[PDB]
Structure 1
Amino acid sequence: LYETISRIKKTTKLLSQEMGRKPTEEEIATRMEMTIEKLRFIAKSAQLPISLETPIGKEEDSRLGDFIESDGETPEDQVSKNLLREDLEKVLDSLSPRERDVLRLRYGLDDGRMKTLEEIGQIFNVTRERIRQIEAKALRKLRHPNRNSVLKEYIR
């Protein structure tokens, strides 16, 4: 890679012969037998990182990198999701607790996400059926739009 980045265009520089300076265009790829996309792939991967601590500009109040965050949570969806997640079970209040207490969180939810169909088969009512039915029962004990009809704005 660190040689293609310094050869793909080098060649072209000379390969420019029979062409107009920067020879052809994606024929370059073909010239070196490659696919543009990989080319950009290589083109993109060149030069170097910027300082990220260099003056913003002619002025000061400026080393770069005074200068981003990726992620916190955008306070907005941390006060959201908790409400949502918590409510996903906090509004689980339109059913008898035979399912409300178990299938509540599918086979996981809040969990890494799992302890499953078997387990409940035993873990709760020595079932293997009753999982799917009472779960489906509750799986509908919330959908006809009136069941748990306090979080319809969810539209999610």
Structure 2
Amino acid sequence: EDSIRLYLQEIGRIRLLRADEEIELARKIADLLELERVRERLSEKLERDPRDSEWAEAVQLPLPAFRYRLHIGRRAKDKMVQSNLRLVVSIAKKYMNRGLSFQDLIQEGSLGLIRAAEKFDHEKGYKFSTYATWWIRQAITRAIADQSRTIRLPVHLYETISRIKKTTKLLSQEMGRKPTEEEIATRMEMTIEKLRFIAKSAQLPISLETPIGKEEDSRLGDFIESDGETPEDQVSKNLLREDLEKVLDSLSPRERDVLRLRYGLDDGRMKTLEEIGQIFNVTRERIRQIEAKALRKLRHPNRNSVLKEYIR
């Protein structure tokens, strides 16, 4: 169940090739490649895709021989991407320890492998070993940086951070332990504010349950609470409600309505005096008057002196 090996065996049992052998290819691959982008051209102009027949190419072809031509053309790439297999693992494995996962890598490469596998030109002669491996690398990096972190950060910043590390190490050389920061900013181009941000920004989270420590007795996170609140607060509040309620609800019961209408005591903050004026009985000159009236009424000692302690 090695998985890595379980695939590694088998790829073994596909065997490596040489430039010449991979040349018959190249042509064929191109022969298929371009052919399709016919298929796309004809797509884009029309019906969105030839994607019928021998007319699934605008080109001319005895139809059976088309699909055939296609087969050999792309079979080359298939019989090439896999044909390589190794070397990409020699590359990906370098990131099997960097992060992601040996298998995870392998794929990624693969992806690349493809792309290269076809964006690739036997006319410049020198082998894909000095080009395929390029695309690979690329692919990869864009994976442990695209994830393997469970909080995706600007893959660009990653470099900046590293670049800082190197540049700061240079400072450290002259100024040991690079105590310089804002002076490092003369070479860091930005206040330590972001430097420190970067520091935290480049933090990897913690299992929430690593067993605590100084004792294997328990995981972590088991000493905190959710976004919820203790009843102690809940209640106090709810007191407020009524406390109020009555205390308001002992002066002009009608007006008390607007007290809750143009304000809260329910679920509007609000009903803009405008709308409210008419809401209760259609009014313009009977609102902010009773409004202040209500407040100043329940205001002043004996009245406001009830929330004086329950200012919640």
| Aligned residue among 172, 183, 192 for 1:16 | 172
41-50 vs 146-155, which deviates more? 146-155
Moved more, 104-113 or 68-77: 104-113
Distance in 2 of aligned mates of 1:76 and 1:8: 49
1:26 maps onto 2:186 in alignment: no
Alpha-carbon deviation of 1:96?
1.4
- Report % sequence identity: 100
Aligned length: 156
Show the counterpart of 1:80: 236
Normalised by the size of structure 2, how large is the TM-score? Answer: 0.45
CA contact (8 A) 1:94 1:148 kept: no
1:112/1:67 CA distance change after superposition, 3 Å = farther
Contact 2:185/2:192, CA 8 A, preserved across alignment: yes
Alpha-carbon distance between aligned partners in 2 of 1:101 and 1:112, rounded to the nearest angstrom? 12
Larger Rg: 2
Shift, 1:132, TM fit: 0.2
Rounded to whole Å, the distance in 2 between the matches of 1:67 and 1:2 is 33
Structure 1: where are the runs of 5+ without partners? none
Mark the CA change 1:10 to 1:112 in structure 2 (over 3 Å): closer, same or farther.
Answer: farther
* Alpha-carbon spacing, 1:105–1:121, altered in 2? closer, same or farther (3 Å): closer
How far residue 94 of structure 1 moved from its aligned partner, in angstroms, is 3.7
Cα distance 1:24–1:149, how it changes in 2: closer, same or farther (>3 A)? closer
The answer on whether the counterparts of 1:94 and 1:142 sit within 8 Å (CA) in structure 2 is no
Deviations 1:66-123 (A, max 9, x none): 2311432211010111111332323213411231122235433431422211111110
Residue 307 of structure 2: aligned partner: 151
Matching residue of 1:125: 281
**Deviates further, 57-66 or 138-147:** 57-66
CA distance in 1, matches of 2:220, 2:191: 35
Change (3 A) 1:24 1:150: closer
Of Structure 1 and Structure 2, which has the larger fraction of its residues in helix?
2
Q: TM-score under structure 1 normalisation?
A: 0.85
Matching residue of 1:57: 213
Conserved? CA contact 1:17–1:23, under 8 Å: no
Give, in whole Å, the separation in 1 of the partners of 2:190 and 2:302: 59
